[PDB]
Design a protein around this ligand. Structure first.
Ligand SMILES: COc1cncc(N2CCc3nc(NC(C)=O)sc3C2)n1
Length: 843
């Protein structure tokens, strides 16, 4: 069951999709997979330390960087502790444990077992890790801040309670019968054919077509299409891709071998996805839910079972050549035959693996078996250091083999939760490339989220973002989400509920406001009136008392600071919202700022931001900090989501719009003044000059690499404290934004050098060749990003921007001399493209 059906209505509304719905399935893969996941769920729900789960201590094994060791000169660290408006400070050793610190303290208050929380956050200092290795702590030191902690009692784990569960030698051939569309697009008598491809990692094995016929709402062929491939030569996760041309209009897929290892038989009526204008949506096994409008196709299958010596110098060297090669450098057939013939040697190089597995005739069963026997003797892989780049490459769209893919996931098992989070978004996107719903990766995500509430929390928002936005992959993800929610345990189930209500109310209000101010760049007085009046109407009796901040889940937002809420001056109309802090133990009257925006696809932003955090950990590996500000951003629904407001920041634009703000005129000395008036000490000023030379530099390198470098002044921001950063990534050229305003902070004005600019060029180039040491990682992440994240994109040229950007094939010399001249454009062009945004207002 009676109540067991509410739970299911509870799940469905937290998901935003009904997994019990079967109107859009031509088999039971989804149901079977809802079934399959219970165990890995129940297994992980069975095996998690209830208290450690409840406190989700956030923590790393990485060393502390050179830079933050320079921040400590006593081998000793200060921590302020409070109980109830009593508070004292303790000199602690960087290697001290939490429990070990309770010893130095049960020494104090009085002259049972309690826990240390961060003041203001649902964030705890527990577990047998040294304080140096909690992430909050490294965070405090970086920004120059005290460590404040309250002694309370731990969260009862009975709040994590989980509801009790209740579970041939023939050639291949396919009868195409015809297609039907109800209403016809273009109407002038055109010409139309079907194309049917047998696929495996975009590797096309065989292809057949039809005779073309007149494109009328119904087109009937009734033809057998006999392929070259043999039934016994079909591989698992091979797709029957079916496409319609006149050129490409619609596409649809059918897994030829089903999730039971069963060849696929019978009649199918497939509703087809329509093209807009390669792309992960193209790969999907899902069918178009919109049956009323969509093109569809009828087919039939009547087709049961199935489940050394020493190499010469000059070839080794071709092989090593091949292997050295970047991910996107394609293999000649010469290349591939080499790789294969010498597969056992190729096996001793883990860098080879992607290249080697894309040198497999997956359309011969004989070869696949040899390939599986290859995968048997996996000593060398099994024992290699985890290379995420490498590992990820084996998860992309090029690899549709269950067992190749599965070796990559074996490697991920060894990631700590710290890193799981780094790549979590990209791993979640990688599911799009899994041929089946139920996959080792899916399972790995499921597992790891249930294991740790932080990962679980982000996993939720990531899956939900996609479910709500993408029809191609919402069924699959919805099944993985349900699986998660079923184990995350009631505490979280309530948190998610709080959150989902709030963000649904606030998007109502976001969109209603765009209706009102049409475009008219001004926000009428009446617009804020109503904005104000609604938020009063919303808190009244409806909104949650409080709630976790999806982008920063340690933070429980309280009530709204309605006085300070507003709408922004955009052509879009984003909401500027500020909330009180629900935690009354917190340190500040500083509100929680959140912007709500409809108008740009924010998945794209999420992806860039993540890559930014990765670049930042890469610089952590050379003891480098470049002070990037990858503020929080969460896609929640359709071209809509939320954003962290970064306190005490303005637009480079508005800094020009201060003294001038004209019809578009710029001045050089003005940034540097803005900083002086916001630096109560002259040190603090040069420290802002400081943070800026870094932030500026880092943002110069990263932006060039991704190719999002020619940006307006308006979409770059700086803090009152010197931290510059780009924003709004949903939105003569120039490689990046290094304006003349910037360089004058570096003691220079177009065509000279200085103490702080030599330093700028120093970091830049170091930063640049540091990323180049992780070239293949960035290539793979960017490539994947594009495929899962974007519009359409050319599966050569778009993808291939970044390898000329990272100046592949070159030496730290040539490469620096590449990047250095990229600077000496922004010195030639100065204002000239900055200048340009506006002029095109009419061009
Ligand atoms: C126009 O909508 C978009 C889209 N993407 C990002 C973005 N910014 C994100 C970070 C950010 N911090 C601010 N702090 C202050 C004090 O104004 S304002 C802002 C807006 N704004």
């Amino acid at each position: 069951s009676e109540e067991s059906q509410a739970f299911q209505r509870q799940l469905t509304a937290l998901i935003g999709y009904d997994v019990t719905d079967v109107s859009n399935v031509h088999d039971d893969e989804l149901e079977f997979t809802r079934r399959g996941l219970v165990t890995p769920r129940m297994a992980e729900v069975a095996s998690r330390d209830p208290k450690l789960y409840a406190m989700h201590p956030w923590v790393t094994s990485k060393p502390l960087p050179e830079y933050l060791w320079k921040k400590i000169a006593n081998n000793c660290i200060f921590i302020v502790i409070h109980r109830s408006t009593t508070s004292q400070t303790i000199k602690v050793s960087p290697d001290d444990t939490p429990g070990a610190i309770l010893q130095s303290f049960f020494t104090k208050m009085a002259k049972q077992d309690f826990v240390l929380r961060v003041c203001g956050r649902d964030e705890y200092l527990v577990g047998e890790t040294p304080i140096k290795n909690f992430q909050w702590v490294r965070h405090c030191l970086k920004n120059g801040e005290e460590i404040h902690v309250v002694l309370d009692t731990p969260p009862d784990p009975a709040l994590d309670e989980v509801r009790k569960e209740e579970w041939c030698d023939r050639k291949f051939r396919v009868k195409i019968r015809g297609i039907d569309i109800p209403v016809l697009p273009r109407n002038t008598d055109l010409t139309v054919f079907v194309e049917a491809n047998i696929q495996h990692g975009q590797q096309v094995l065989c292809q057949r077509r039809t005779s073309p016929k007149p494109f009328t709402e119904e087109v009937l062929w009734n033809v057998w299409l006999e392929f070259s491939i043999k039934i016994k030569d079909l591989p698992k996760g091979a797709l029957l891709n079916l496409q319609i041309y006149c050129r490409l209009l619609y596409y649809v897929n059918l897994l030829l071998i089903d999730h039971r290892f069963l060849l696929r038989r019978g009649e199918y009526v497939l509703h087809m996805w329509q093209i807009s204008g390669f792309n992960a949506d193209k790969l999907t096994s899902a069918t178009n839910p919109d049956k009323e409008n969509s093109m569809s196709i009828s087919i039939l299958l009547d087709n049961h079972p199935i489940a050394r010596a020493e190499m010469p110098n000059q070839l080794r060297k071709q092989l090593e050549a091949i292997i050295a090669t970047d991910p996107l450098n394609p293999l000649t057939a010469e290349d591939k035959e080499l790789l294969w013939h010498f597969r056992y040697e190729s096996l001793k190089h883990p860098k080879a693996y992607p290249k080697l597995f894309s040198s497999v005739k997956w359309g011969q069963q004989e070869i696949v078996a040899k390939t599986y026997q290859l995968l048997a003797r996996r000593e060398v892989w099994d024992q290699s250091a985890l290379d995420v780049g490498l590992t990820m490459q084996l998860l992309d769209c090029n690899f549709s083999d269950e067992n190749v893919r599965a070796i990559a996931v074996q490697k991920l098992e060894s990631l700590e939760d710290d890193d799981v989070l780094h790549y979590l978004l990209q791993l979640v996107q990688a599911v799009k490339f899994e041929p089946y719903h139920d996959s080792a990766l899916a399972r790995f995500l499921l597992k790891r989220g249930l294991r740790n509430k932080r990962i679980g929390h982000f996993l939720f928002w990531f899956l939900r973002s996609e479910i709500a936005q993408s029809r191609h992959y919402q069924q699959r993800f919805a099944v993985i989400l349900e699986a998660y929610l079923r184990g995350c345990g009631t505490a979280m189930l309530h948190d998610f509920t709080q959150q989902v209500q709030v963000i649904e109310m606030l998007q109502k209000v976001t969109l209603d406001i765009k209706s009102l101010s049409a475009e008219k760049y001004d926000v009428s007085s009446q617009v804020i009136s109503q904005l104000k009046q609604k938020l009063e109407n919303l808190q009244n009796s409806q909104l949650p008392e409080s709630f976790r901040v999806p982008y920063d889940p340690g933070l429980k937002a309280g009530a709204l600071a309605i006085e300070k809420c507003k709408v922004m001056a955009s052509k879009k109309k984003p909401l500027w919202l500020e909330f009180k802090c629900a935690d009354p133990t917190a340190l500040s009257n500083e509100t929680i700022g959140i912007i709500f925006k409809h108008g740009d696809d924010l998945r794209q932003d999420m992806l860039i931001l993540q890559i930014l955090r990765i670049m930042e950990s890469i610089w952590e590996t050379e003891s480098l900090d470049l002070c990037l500000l990858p503020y929080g951003c969460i896609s929640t629904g359709d071209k809509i989501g939320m954003i962290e407001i970064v306190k005490d920041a303005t637009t480079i634009a508005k800094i020009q719009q201060s003294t001038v703000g004209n019809t578009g005129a710029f001045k050089d000395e003005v940034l540097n003044h803005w900083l002086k008036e916001k630096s109560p000490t002259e040190e603090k000023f040069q420290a802002a000059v400081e943070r800026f030379v870094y932030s500026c530099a880092g943002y110069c390198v990263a932006t060039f690499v991704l190719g999002i470098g020619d940006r307006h002044n308006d979409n770059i921001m700086i803090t009152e404290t010197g931290n510059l950063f780009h924003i709004d990534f949903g939105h003569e050229r120039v490689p990046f934004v290094l304006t003349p305003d910037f360089l004058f902070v570096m003691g220079t004005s177009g065509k000279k050098t200085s103490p702080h600019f030599q330093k700028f060029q120093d970091i830049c180039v170091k930063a640049y060749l540091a990323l180049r040491h992780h070239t293949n990682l960035l290539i793979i992440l960017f490539s994947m990003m594009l495929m899962t994240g974007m519009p359409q994109l050319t599966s050569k040229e778009d993808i291939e921007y970044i390898r000329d950007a990272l100046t592949v094939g070159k030496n730290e010399e040539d490469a620096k001399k590449y990047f250095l001249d990229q600077i000496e454009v922004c010195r030639d062009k100065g204002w000239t493209v900055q200048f340009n945004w506006f002029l095109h207002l009419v061009l």
